Structure 1
Amino acid sequence: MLSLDQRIQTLAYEELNKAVEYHQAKAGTVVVLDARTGEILALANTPGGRNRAVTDMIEPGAAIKPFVIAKALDAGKTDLNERLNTQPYKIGPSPVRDTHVYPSLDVRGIMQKSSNVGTSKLSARFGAEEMYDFYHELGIGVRMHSGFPGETAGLLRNWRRWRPIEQATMSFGYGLQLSLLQLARAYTALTHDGVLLPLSFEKQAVAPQGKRIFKESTAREVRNLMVSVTEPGGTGTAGAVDGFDVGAKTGTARKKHVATFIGFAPAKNPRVIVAVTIDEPTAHGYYGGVVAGPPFKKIMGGSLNILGISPTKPLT
């Protein structure tokens, strides 16, 4: 039988539409996954021309940063105590900067404040070929074979053509591309304790055999870091869900802007992944947290409710 949950599908499409209209956007997409099995619970596109979750590739922006941070932790290139100099810099003429100047951040801060500088410095501790293989094993550039026509493979440029500035910008999500379904898939490596799942349109009695990408301890620490994104001081507080700890990342691509919000809950033992992108918002903000956060919040909270997941902390 199909994995789609019609209750979540309806909830996803309605909230997506509210957001796209309210922000006077061109389009929008939602993916909802079972965080433990990878089955696809919901897939919503508006307007309903094509399956943009599968056909349209986007630059993930900051939504890629957790994987770089996870890889740096996993390989022992950093730890939870290091404070990195996160002053903006240039490589040749090209700047690498954050929205604010943070003189130093630890890894939690790099996640919480979404530091392009900190993430690029962690990525630079790896060679281009290593980082290329890592992005490829996350599935970037690898077709999903979903069976929808026009399905995209995404874009992963051959590592031999990378300039050093390009490795840096890929680490915070520019210069590589993937569909929203590919991005949601990558997040199963974080929610399923380091094991990337293949995804499925059929119900899974047990989590299928995946592929380990991170140690379990790495994945668990990274999930805890991502909760700071939705707590005060983080960039994605608009995606907080009452009664739950939500690990998330928010991002803004450039096209004009594409606002993205992706997250999972309960963060400690995830049940659901919700990924929202809003194409070309023109009203009431353009950042991922402001535009895609609110629909994420509604779709996640409703999905947890529909699925009978009780809150882990008192409601406020």
Structure 2
Amino acid sequence: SVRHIAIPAHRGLITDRNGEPLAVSTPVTTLWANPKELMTAKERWPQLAAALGQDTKLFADRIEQNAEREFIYLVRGLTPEQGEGVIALKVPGVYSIEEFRRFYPAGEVVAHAVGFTDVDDRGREGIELAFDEWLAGVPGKRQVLKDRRGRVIKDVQVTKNAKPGKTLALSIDLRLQYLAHRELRNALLENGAKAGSLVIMDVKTGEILAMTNQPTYNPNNRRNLQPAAMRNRAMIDVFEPGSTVKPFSMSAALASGRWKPSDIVDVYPGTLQIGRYTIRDVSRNSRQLDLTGILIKSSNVGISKIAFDIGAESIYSVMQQVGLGQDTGLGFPGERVGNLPNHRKWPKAETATLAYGAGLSVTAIQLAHAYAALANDGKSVPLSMTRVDRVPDGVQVISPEVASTVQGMLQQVVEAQGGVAQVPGYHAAGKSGTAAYRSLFAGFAPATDPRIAMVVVIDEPSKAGLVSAPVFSKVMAGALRLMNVPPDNLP
């Protein structure tokens, strides 16, 4: 026969933004065998079987029914030294090829972002899949002719070296990723919740600094792996963002020319009839509220009446421009786009629902990206999961004046009240949402020069919006300090 013998390539190293290893190709031994040669040394089979801890008769049966085949694995991806224990038997037809297996040093802490490789050392999930073309490199080649018993008869013509894959530096900071993983895991146990997501973005660069989900898994130990636990929820799970989009409804109002923060809406009696449909506030002891008051009293009635005044088109436009229901450009296969509905004529019911964040569906990544644009004085920088050394130009999606006013309003949402999101030493700005409940918090800090945007989503808390705020407060306090951001609550 003439046979191609592929030479394994070294898969590219994945690191942290700081160069901390997240995915490393480990040298391993792959005991294969040439059945046709084994078939001439059957008295050695029981020993070899015991070494591979297989049943003697199952092993025997395997080799016998593969007697015509020149190639089969005994144990793929065995560790070396153990594999030198079997080569030690000197059993005819039993060989070794040096192979590469992925090790994930940070295991479960960054499982969804980094992902893992299939059996063939090919990317299957997360960055490993999305950058498979970059990380894979090029296998080398031997071309061999073989004996009738499958032995290497030489005439090998022009062995290729094999091209290694390139190293890739993520935008992820492993110090913020650990802090986010630990606080989200603790939040789920405290609040008895099922699942959750936490994204941290750099508002100046578009870099995702942290992306964690619960449940998680150990990518080094995928024995008892729940498909559930493998879900990168931050990028795959769409939800109604609800009240967390009210800052965008306020942005459209402030850009209309018809609204300033001190203008008043009468929300009495805390409900509003739309034909048959009835919009309903949770607290219904308000009459006149200004725009900051509408966010502080969580009035759906107030945001609905402003939306009727400015039109859904202006609200639709801001939401689309900040990337809600829009392709993120990260080209992670399976990443969801969600749904921002569009109409020629926006009826009253759909205008109100859009404005308070019902009837659209977004990902945690999209919402973080939208808060990032708002935090970055209305300028949207492109999302990246890889380290950004040279920052692309942002698109101005909200006017700097409007963005700056909405930042101010969201800082009074966090401050004016106290306890019930506060980040001691820093001015933080944020908005809670509550959509089987989902608890949301979206925010950014510090208010004087925003650095970080963060989204917290918690799925079905039991031990009871206000389950999300304390996670935000704790992760933001830690993230800003890990990034040496100077505290901005100054006299």
TM value normalised by structure 1: 0.92
Structure 2 residue runs of 5 or longer lacking an equivalent are: 1-168, 217-229
Counterpart-to-counterpart distance in 2, 1:99 and 1:199:
35
Please say if 1:63 is aligned against 2:255.
no
Indicate which of 440, 452, 456 corresponds to 1:272: 452
Indicate which of 331, 334, 350 corresponds to 1:147: 331
Counterpart-to-counterpart distance in 2, 1:296 and 1:128:
30
Match of 2:486 in 1: 310
Deviation at 1:46, TM superposition (A): 0.7
Percentage of matched positions with identical amino acids: 40
Is the CA contact 1:226–1:249 (under 8 Å) kept in the aligned structure 2? yes
Please say if 1:191 is aligned against 2:191.
no
Match of 1:115 in 2: 299
Deviation at 1:162, TM superposition (A): 4.6
Counterpart-to-counterpart distance in 1, 2:420 and 2:330:
32
Indicate which of 260, 267, 288 corresponds to 2:440: 260
SS where residue 199 of structure 2 aligns? strand
Amino acid aligned to 2:481: N
With over 3 angstroms needed to count, the CA separation of the structure-2 counterparts of 1:231 and 1:16, relative to structure 1, is same
Pairing of 1:293-308 with structure 2 (within 5 A): 293-308=469-484
Root-mean-square deviation over aligned CA pairs: 1.8
With over 3 angstroms needed to count, the CA separation of the structure-2 counterparts of 1:219 and 1:132, relative to structure 1, is closer
Deviation at 1:147, TM superposition (A): 3.1
Amino acid aligned to 2:478: G
Indicate which of 172, 182, 205 corresponds to 1:37: 205
Counterpart-to-counterpart distance in 2, 1:187 and 1:60:
12
Counterpart-to-counterpart distance in 2, 1:162 and 1:148:
33
Match of 2:31 in 1: none
SS where residue 159 of structure 1 aligns? coil
SS where residue 197 of structure 2 aligns? strand
Offset from partner CA, 1:231-280 (integer Å, 9 cap, x none): 2427xx46111111110000001xx1000011111112101111100001
Deviation at 1:161, TM superposition (A): 7.3
Is the CA contact 1:220–1:268 (under 8 Å) kept in the aligned structure 2? no
Offset from partner CA, 1:160-211 (integer Å, 9 cap, x none): 4753112101111111010000001111221111112221112234542122
Deviation at 1:99, TM superposition (A): 1.7
Relative CO higher for 1 or 2, CA cutoff 8 Å, sep ≥ 6?
1
SS where residue 170 of structure 1 aligns? helix
Indicate which of 410, 429, 438 corresponds to 1:226: 410
SS where residue 263 of structure 1 aligns? strand
Pairing of 1:65-80 with structure 2 (within 5 A): 65-80=246-261
Pairing of 1:168-207 with structure 2 (within 5 A): 168-205=352-389, 207=391
SS where residue 178 of structure 1 aligns? coil
Is the CA contact 2:312–2:355 (under 8 Å) kept in the aligned structure 1? no
SS where residue 330 of structure 2 aligns? coil
SS where residue 260 of structure 2 aligns? coil
With over 3 angstroms needed to count, the CA separation of the structure-2 counterparts of 1:244 and 1:238, relative to structure 1, is farther
Deviation at 1:139, TM superposition (A): 1.6
Is the CA contact 2:252–2:315 (under 8 Å) kept in the aligned structure 1? no
With over 3 angstroms needed to count, the CA separation of the structure-2 counterparts of 1:303 and 1:194, relative to structure 1, is same
Offset from partner CA, 1:67-101 (integer Å, 9 cap, x none): 11011102212012211112221111222222212
Deviation at 1:303, TM superposition (A): 0.1
Is the CA contact 2:303–2:356 (under 8 Å) kept in the aligned structure 1? yes
Amino acid aligned to 2:453: I
SS where residue 42 of structure 1 aligns? strand
Match of 1:96 in 2: 279
Match of 2:422 in 1: 240
Counterpart-to-counterpart distance in 2, 1:128 and 1:275:
25
Please say if 1:19 is aligned against 2:187.
yes
Offset from partner CA, 1:140-172 (integer Å, 9 cap, x none): 222213232211111122314753112101111
Number of aligned residue pairs: give it.
307
Amino acid aligned to 2:428: V
SS where residue 45 of structure 1 aligns? strand
Deviation at 1:65, TM superposition (A): 0.3
Match of 1:54 in 2: 235
Match of 1:2 in 2: 170
Is the CA contact 2:448–2:488 (under 8 Å) kept in the aligned structure 1? no
